[PDB]
Design a protein around this ligand. Structure first.
Ligand SMILES: [Pt+2]
Ligand SMILES: [Pt+2]
Ligand SMILES: [Pt+2]
Ligand SMILES: [Pt+2]
Ligand SMILES: [Pt+2]
Ligand SMILES: [Pt+2]
Ligand SMILES: [Pt+2]
Length: 263
């Protein structure tokens, strides 16, 4: 009742019916067909499918709850873009303070898309949400450390030259006690999410340059938190993916925005 699963084509149709051109880019939900010819068949098929789903009334009215959820996602005031990688999983956490539950989560997995209305009041409530595309690993245990992008680039060069990961972890000086975790961060199997925060305050559509990554490895969950140093270069802190640390990192990420104070 607070959630609906749809086809991506179903979703596109309702977006069109509510007046929204398109969905947030992160979802990659583009026009289903090609011609003026495909458009007409698509529309016939979708009117029919939404009706058989009770989401479109005989009188042509979009279910008011699903309509609102799709509008929140399409016309968001504040959002987190979620890009999941692992062996197309894309999400967005959207809030549209005006119209709306105060959050709508959209999760697109291949040809389907779920929309879930939630009440989120603190960043800790987001940990199970962001975790949907990960693999439910417990937190990794290791001493937090940082790596610069230039240092990472030199490591990559060495690795490309055929140096062992072991030799490259020595070059970086990773303590032996931390290597099970660090060698897992840089090996499969793994799953991760790249998160960017956005807002539409001025009607101007700012996103964080920073993007936070959460990575589930064989040695547990790790949080990677980049920051841009004064000379521009990215520097990342790698830390244990506890729910607490994750919550703080999500707060921190959002803090970069003008909006500033989502909670
Ligand atoms: Pt037909
Ligand atoms: Pt079709
Ligand atoms: Pt409502
Ligand atoms: Pt892979
Ligand atoms: Pt990096
Ligand atoms: Pt070289
Ligand atoms: Pt760089």
């Amino acid at each position: 009742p607070n959630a609906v699963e749809l086809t991506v084509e179903n979703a596109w149709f309702i977006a069109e019916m509510v007046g929204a051109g398109t969905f947030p880019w992160v979802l990659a939900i583009t026009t289903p067909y090609s011609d003026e010819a495909q458009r007409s068949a698509f529309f016939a098929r979708q009117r029919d499918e939404l009706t058989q789903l009770g989401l479109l009334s005989s009188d042509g009215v979009v279910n008011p709850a699903v309509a609102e959820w799709i509008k929140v996602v399409c016309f968001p005031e504040r959002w987190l873009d979620l890009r999941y990688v692992g062996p197309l999983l894309r999400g967005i956490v959207a809030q549209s303070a005006g119209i709306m539950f105060n959050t709508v989560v959209a999760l697109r997995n291949a040809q389907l898309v779920t929309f879930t209305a939630m009440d989120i009041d603190d960043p800790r409530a987001l940990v199970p949400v962001l975790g949907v595309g990960l693999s439910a690993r417990p937190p990794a245990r290791f001493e937090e450390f940082s790596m610069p992008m230039r240092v990472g680039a030199r490591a990559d060069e060495r690795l490309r030259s055929g140096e062992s990961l072991d030799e490259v972890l020595d070059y970086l000086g990773i303590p032996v006690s931390a290597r099970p975790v660090v060698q897992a961060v840089f090996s499969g199997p793994r799953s991760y999410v790249e998160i960017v925060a956005g807002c539409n305050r001025d009607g101007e559509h700012t996103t964080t340059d920073v993007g936070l990554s959460i990575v589930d490895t064989t040695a547990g969950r790790v949080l990677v938190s980049p920051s841009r140093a004064f000379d521009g270069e990215w520097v990342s802190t790698f830390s244990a993916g506890t729910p607490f640390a994750t919550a703080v990192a999500i707060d921190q990420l959002i803090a970069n925005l003008p909006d500033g104070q989502w909670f």
